[PDB]
Design a protein around this ligand. Structure first.
Ligand SMILES: [Zn+2]
Ligand SMILES: [Zn+2]
Lengths: 295, 296
């Protein structure tokens, strides 16, 4: 109906972390997808991908990480590295015969594709594919929907939590298992569609933004603030998030950078707005940028 | 006369990667520090020292709690060499000193530095454990005996060094858990001990075999949050085991032959002699540090 895609792929990544430190080189440790069949309004749990991933930079999971994600150490010690798992994902995609630009990924925020996929793919030396450079931020649709229908007082802290609370849906499994997150998002998505939401891509990864032309005002305590760390990532990572209105999106924008209008084979091979102003303080280096090779 | 049979003592400290709340952790050396002590002249030689940061390979990012404990900033390890390089620099620095084989010994504040940390790091780096790490002076054990001689006090300090400074009434040097400040504290403590009657000699030896590793360990499921219980499993995982020797029983000629198998230390220690297969059965609860190190 409203959704121009015939299939939606709900995606979730879990990463290595250390709660108290934002200057951390997050590596994917779980990669999960569930398919949603748009014309039939059906969640297809039988069409799914669920792999653990062995990190190479930080091989031992932090305790706060395992408490948060619920992933135990054993599951990543027996896992393949990202480059192998991503290849399996590419292969699995092919064995589903979807048409380029007729499926889109759905996430609960900008974190999975703008930050996590982008950063992991630098580590693994993989080109950001066109299907990650265009996606549905479900939480952005949700806030438009709240605005459209009627805001109410929410006490949940996570994106998934609030959406579940607002639509009055029971929490599935537990927070932060990648597959459980996927199922929650899928059930929310379905509900949003039944209530008349237009679910379509709303975020695009772009080589440039005029607001990056102004040097970031450096907050020296950024390493303990999620918001302030976000500002650093925005500058360090090549691709930036540009929003698009539902009515302005077209399926033919697939594979085409919204900013420079070139194909995504040419756009994205090198950073067009390298933050040299952040890179001259030898006294206070940005660890995640150093270890990935941004400088 | 001189109760200490060595001509020079090497005070060693390691700092490692860590994650306070998890003891199933592949500790990697991130600081390697040494200060020399001249025995016949009773002098701490602060000018004869080794002090290097080390870049880990398995856990390249220090946890915040590791940073807070050791005081080591991330930038200092990002710019450092890996253990194999730093260890090679140590070997080279050692030869510069011009020391007679078996006439110098290492000094630590516990069994941790050489029994656990060095042994483990050296399995990761694939370096053979040297003779001068397989016999050493555990100063805290000597300290423990010295308290029986002179009479015990009620100590409130919490670290081994803190205790030793408290008991002998010495001021704390620098900051705790900086490898070099620890070395300086240990050297000063050592000096006081010898001057106050202590018999300072090799008291600990690393051996390939012990009868108490024949009987499978009484497995504690919650071992990962307990320092003592994790020690018990490290004792089984690590090939070489700590064996104590009385002061009057040590002989210089014990370098570098194993107390159990009586073979040179170039032959002993290549292969675990008491592999704890009983511990390696359950793929639903595996020992992480034993797995990444390649013990199974
Ligand atoms: Zn572009
Ligand atoms: Zn032996």
């Amino acid at each position: 109906q409203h959704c121009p895609f015939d299939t939606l792929l709900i995606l979730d990544f879990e990463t290595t972390s250390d709660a108290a430190n934002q200057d951390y080189p997050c590596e994917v440790i779980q990669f999960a997808i569930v398919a949603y069949d748009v014309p039939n309004d059906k969640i297809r749990e039988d069409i799914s991908f669920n792999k653990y991933v062995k990190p190479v930079l930080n091989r031992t999971l932090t305790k706060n990480c395992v408490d948060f994600t619920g992933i135990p150490q054993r599951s990543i010690d027996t896992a393949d590295t990202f480059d192998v798992v991503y290849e399996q994902f590419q292969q699995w995609l092919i064995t589903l015969g979807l048409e380029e630009g007729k499926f889109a990924f759905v996430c609960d925020s900008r974190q999975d594709l703008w930050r996590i996929a982008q950063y992991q793919m630098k580590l693994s030396n993989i080109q950001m594919p066109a299907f990650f450079r265009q996606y549905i931020n479900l939480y952005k649709i949700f806030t438009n929907e709240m605005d459209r229908m009627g805001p109410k007082e929410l006490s949940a802290t996570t994106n998934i939590g609030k959406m579940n609370e607002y639509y009055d849906l029971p929490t599935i499994g537990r927070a932060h298992d990648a597959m459980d997150d996927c199922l929650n998002i899928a059930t929310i998505l379905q509900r949003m569609i039944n209530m008349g939401a237009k679910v379509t891509v709303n975020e695009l990864l772009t080589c440039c933004a005029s607001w990056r032309r102004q040097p970031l005002v450096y907050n020296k305590e950024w390493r303990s603030s999620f918001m302030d760390a976000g500002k650093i990532f925005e500058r360090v990572l090549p691709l930036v998030v540009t929003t698009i209105r539902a009515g302005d999106f077209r399926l033919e924008m697939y594979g085409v950078c919204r900013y420079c209008r070139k194909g995504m084979d040419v756009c994205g091979t090198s950073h067009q707005q390298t933050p040299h102003d952040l890179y001259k303080n030898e006294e206070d280096p940005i660890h995640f940028a150093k270890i990935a090779g941004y400088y």
